[PDB]
C-alpha cells in the first residue's frame, strides 16, 4: 500500500543553480509519448557544482520517505581529455521545510543522503547505438516532521540523465490525512 508524494516521469521546470548553467530539462521524442529528463554533462571544465532542486513536496503523514531514482551515466572514457575533470557519480540531498521557498535556494539548508553511483555506465559504442543502461537506486530518509521537503541533486562534473524521481511512503492507511 504505497502512497506517492512525487513522480517526475508521470508528470510531463525545477530550480537549477547556478542560473543559466548545468542541469537542463530535456526530452527524447523518438516515440509517441515523450521521455523527459534532467541532464547535465559539463565533463571537461573540472570545477562544476550544479544543483537541481525539486519543487516543494508535501510530506503528508509520512514519517519515512522512500526515494527511487532512475538514471544513466556516460562512461568518462567517452570524453577525450576528461580523465581528471569527468566524474561518474552525483550526490543526493534533502531539506525539510514548512514553507515553500519558491525561487529561493539556500544550499546550506540541505543534508546529504548519499553518493549515487551507477551499477552500469553507458559506454560510447552503446550510446551511439542508442543502447543506454538505465540504473535504479533507492534510498530513504526520516524521521520527517515538517509540512514538506525538497530533494536536490548535485553534479560535480558527470554526464547524467535523471529520468525518474519517485517518492512514496508506506502504510498510509494507519494515518489520518489533511
Amino acid at each position: 500500500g504505497e502512497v506517492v508524494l512525487l513522480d517526475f516521469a508521470a508528470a510531463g521546470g525545477w530550480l537549477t543553480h547556478p542560473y543559466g548553467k548545468g542541469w537542463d530539462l530535456m526530452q527524447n521524442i523518438m516515440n509517441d509519448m515523450p521521455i523527459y529528463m534532467y541532464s547535465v554533462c559539463n565533463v571537461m571544465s573540472g570545477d562544476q557544482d550544479n544543483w537541481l532542486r525539486t519543487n516543494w513536496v508535501y510530506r503528508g503523514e509520512a514519517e519515512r520517505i522512500f526515494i527511487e531514482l532512475k538514471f544513466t551515466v556516460r562512461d568518462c572514457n567517452s570524453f577525450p581529455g576528461g580523465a581528471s575533470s569527468c566524474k561518474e557519480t552525483f550526490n543526493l540531498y534533502y531539506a525539510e521545510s514548512d514553507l515553500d521557498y519558491g525561487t529561493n535556494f539556500q544550499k546550506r539548508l540541505f543534508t546529504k543522503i548519499d553518493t549515487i553511483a551507477p551499477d552500469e555506465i553507458t559506454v560510447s559504442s552503446d550510446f551511439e547505438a542508442r543502447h543506454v543502461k538505465l540504473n535504479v537506486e533507492e534510498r530513504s530518509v526520516g524521521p520527517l516532521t515538517r509540512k514538506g521537503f525538497y530533494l536536490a541533486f548535485q553534479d560535480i562534473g558527470a554526464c547524467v540523465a535523471l529520468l525518474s524521481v519517485r517518492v512514496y511512503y508506506k502504510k498510509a492507511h494507519h494515518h489520518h490525512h489533511h
Binding site: 527524447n28 529528463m37 541532464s39 556516460r74
Partner: peptide, 11 residues
C-alpha cells in the same frame, strides 16, 4: 556540448 542521453533536445 556533449549530450547525456541519445536523441535528446531541450524542452
Amino acid at each position: 556540448x556533449w549530450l547525456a542521453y541519445p536523441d535528446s533536445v531541450p524542452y
